[PDB]
Amino acid sequence: DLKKDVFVPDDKEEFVKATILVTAETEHGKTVTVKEDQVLQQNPPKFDKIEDMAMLTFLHEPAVLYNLKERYASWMIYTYSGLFCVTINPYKWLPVYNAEVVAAYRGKKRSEAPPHIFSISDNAYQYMLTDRENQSILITGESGAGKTVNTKRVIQYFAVIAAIGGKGTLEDQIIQANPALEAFGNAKTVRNDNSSRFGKFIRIHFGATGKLASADIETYLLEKSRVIFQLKAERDYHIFYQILSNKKPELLDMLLITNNPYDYAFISQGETTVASIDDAEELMATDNAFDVLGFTTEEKNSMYKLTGAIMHFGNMKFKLKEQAEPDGTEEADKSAYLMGLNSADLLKGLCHPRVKVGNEYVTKGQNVQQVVYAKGALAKAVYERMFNWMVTRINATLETKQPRQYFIGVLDIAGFEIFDFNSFEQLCINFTNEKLQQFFNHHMFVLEQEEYKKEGIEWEFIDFGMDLQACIDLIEKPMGIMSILEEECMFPKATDMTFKAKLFDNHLGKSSNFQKPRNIKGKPEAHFSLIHYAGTVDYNIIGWLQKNKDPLNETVVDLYKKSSLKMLSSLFANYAQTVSALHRENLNKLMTNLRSTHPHFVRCIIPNETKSPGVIDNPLVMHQLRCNGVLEGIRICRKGFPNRILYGDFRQRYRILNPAAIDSRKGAEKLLGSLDIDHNQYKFGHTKVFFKAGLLGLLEEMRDER
Ligand SMILES: Nc1ncnc2c1ncn2[C@@H]1O[C@H](COP(=O)(O)OP(=O)(O)O)[C@@H](O)[C@H]1O
Ligand code: VO4
Ligand SMILES: [Mg+2]
Numbered sequence: 001d002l003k004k005d006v007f008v009p010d011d012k013e014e015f016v017k018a019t020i021l022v023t024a025e026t027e028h029g030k031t032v033t034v035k036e037d038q039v040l041q042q043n044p045p046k047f048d049k050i051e052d053m054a055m056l057t058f059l060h061e062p063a064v065l066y067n068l069k070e071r072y073a074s075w076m077i078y079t080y081s082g083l084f085c086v087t088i089n090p091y092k093w094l095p096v097y098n099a100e101v102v103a104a105y106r107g108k109k110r111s112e113a114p115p116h117i118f119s120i121s122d123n124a125y126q127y128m129l130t131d132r133e134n135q136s137i138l139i140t141g142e143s144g145a146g147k148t149v150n151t152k153r154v155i156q157y158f159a160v161i162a163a164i165g166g167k168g169t170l171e172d173q174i175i176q177a178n179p180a181l182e183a184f185g186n187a188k189t190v191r192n193d194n195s196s197r198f199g200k201f202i203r204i205h206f207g208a209t210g211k212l213a214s215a216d217i218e219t220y221l222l223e224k225s226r227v228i229f230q231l232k233a234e235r236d237y238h239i240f241y242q243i244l245s246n247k248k249p250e251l252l253d254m255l256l257i258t259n260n261p262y263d264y265a266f267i268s269q270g271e272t273t274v275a276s277i278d279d280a281e282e283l284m285a286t287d288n289a290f291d292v293l294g295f296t297t298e299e300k301n302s303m304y305k306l307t308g309a310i311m312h313f314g315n316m317k318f319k320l321k322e323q324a325e326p327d328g329t330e331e332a333d334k335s336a337y338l339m340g341l342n343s344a345d346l347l348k349g350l351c352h353p354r355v356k357v358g359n360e361y362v363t364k365g366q367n368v369q370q371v372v373y374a375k376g377a378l379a380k381a382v383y384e385r386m387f388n389w390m391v392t393r394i395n396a397t398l399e400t401k402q403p404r405q406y407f408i409g410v411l412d413i414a415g416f417e418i419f420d421f422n423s424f425e426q427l428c429i430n431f432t433n434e435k436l437q438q439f440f441n442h443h444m445f446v447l448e449q450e451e452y453k454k455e456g457i458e459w460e461f462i463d464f465g466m467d468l469q470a471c472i473d474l475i476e477k478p479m480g481i482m483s484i485l486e487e488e489c490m491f492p493k494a495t496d497m498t499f500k501a502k503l504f505d506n507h508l509g510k511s512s513n514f515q516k517p518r519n520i521k522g523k524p525e526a527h528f529s530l531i532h533y534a535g536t537v538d539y540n541i542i543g544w545l546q547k548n549k550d551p552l553n554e555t556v557v558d559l560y561k562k563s564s565l566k567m568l569s570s571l572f573a574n575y576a577q578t579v580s581a582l583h584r585e586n587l588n589k590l591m592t593n594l595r596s597t598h599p600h601f602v603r604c605i606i607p608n609e610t611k612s613p614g615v616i617d618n619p620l621v622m623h624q625l626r627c628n629g630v631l632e633g634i635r636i637c638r639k640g641f642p643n644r645i646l647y648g649d650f651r652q653r654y655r656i657l658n659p660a661a662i663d664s665r666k667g668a669e670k671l672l673g674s675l676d677i678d679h680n681q682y683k684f685g686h687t688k689v690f691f692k693a694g695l696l697g698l699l700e701e702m703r704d705e706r
Pocket of ligand 3: 147148194195196197413414415
């Protein structure tokens, strides 16, 4: 029936379906009666599994939710929601990404094909060529939402398309770039078995005529901590376990290592084996990528060797001679050999680092705690610089002579996360997520409406309540969290509790997003809460000062410069601005570069905590849609004018409909006036015609009929 089919709220599944008898029979048999305002209307059965939710008769939270659920139940993981797309992780291989599908998607306008990541990529390609404007596919979502998978699919689309008309070709190299970086930059966290522990902006360059000419990858802050430290239910980087699988046994001999991960302390404090990952086939995938990318055998063995030496570096034991002196050089020797260093000099550098007395030097003393930190810090430093060397190396092969004119950047940041223990690297991760959401908010809600004003369109502003400046300002602005941290790791007599005290003194009761920690019994200790867009996060400030300073035993880095392993020497070649400072510098650099592109938002949704295919946790999925502003992003499309054409281009294409109607603007007034259309569905701007949602479809349908 018309009014019988309704949605009623539900304390366990957010909302549930109902049949009116206000008293109504629930989808699950519960005879429940509720308040008339709490009842939302179901959409007609013609809109079941709708490809675009802006086309629904009833727009509300359960109408969107149940449509997404319905599509997901038929394994339809892509859905349009106004000018952007939403995708729910299937946690399962679907046959929607083959070459035959890629080929079919080529050139098809959004409406001419089912919703898909291929359609986003293709239409970004058409906009780039048509408007002569750089494009950017911006993929959002928490840890394990599916950003990396969708990112790899955009590359796949472009690479397959460019092939239809180092060792490999530009297209294969662009594809293989991801398995090479994932090996060293991805790791199993609680939420994701292949969690991206770093952000990346991949630009795909095209010539004036659309030919794929080049590519570049820029990465953002890697989780160095992971190299030498793990939480209970997480692993170190993929590579360590892949190398230990022994699929390449020469590697173990070269790296002087056992096959047991539990032998190496740096890499075995959490988990070692992951059901989802076959570390052995993965090592082959890792190695193969390096070959296709043009990495020499010395280049490869140098990366392997440096990883190996890092493992031994962890097992370097130290004792009291307060002054530390070594406690067995066995592992210290294995590391120095692999690193092209003198083992005695490495240990003298560690236990007694120099202090320059003009042109002479005097050593300083170090205790076992000081040496153990120094040792850990140098391994993280190496790994970070090795990942950086590897990215520049990939770029060097991807950088072709070929002429470029445009680009399509694809942003794959590390997703929003909440662990049992959240520290500095969680803050940097969630900060980016907050920033990108605000980028969506500003583009979708602010710039959009300011275009209607610019064009002299009759429009009365809408406040969608989509603004995160308060929380962004708290983290980045002066006297914010990072500003306080930056100043504190400058005063040498500062402590974790002086930074914690300064944090509280400036924001407790002053900043609304800065709150006391909501510490629950058993869980690790936290110092403050941060009301982020996707949740409140309890951060622990222990060690943040040293994380931001990131000092190294300079005496050991000098031996690294002097190393007889070309790679290790060049990693520290220029060695001599805090972590958070460069993080904000890079983030602001990125947000402004994305301002100069036409953006394409792909919103990934994690369906459940248990990595369960087809299974949707209504509360969790709704929370995502809510903190993403999906319902707001659809409303601005329905309530506004999402489509607009210049008077010239409207004449050049649609004059055919009624050639009797032909000035460029006056002609469009006659053409639209003469056609049988709702004369409220279009408004005249200074230089453009503003179409209400759907009308442009009718006009392109009427153009095809002759
Ligand atoms: N479209 C998809 N098809 C199949 N599996 C997917 C898809 N998207 C995500 N997944 C699954 O989710 C996991 C995590 O996805 P991923 O993109 O790596 O997460 P994140 O948002 O952290 O980058 C993948 O390893 C895979 O199992
Ligand atoms: O798990 V993530 O790839 O979103 O960091
Ligand atoms: Mg990722």
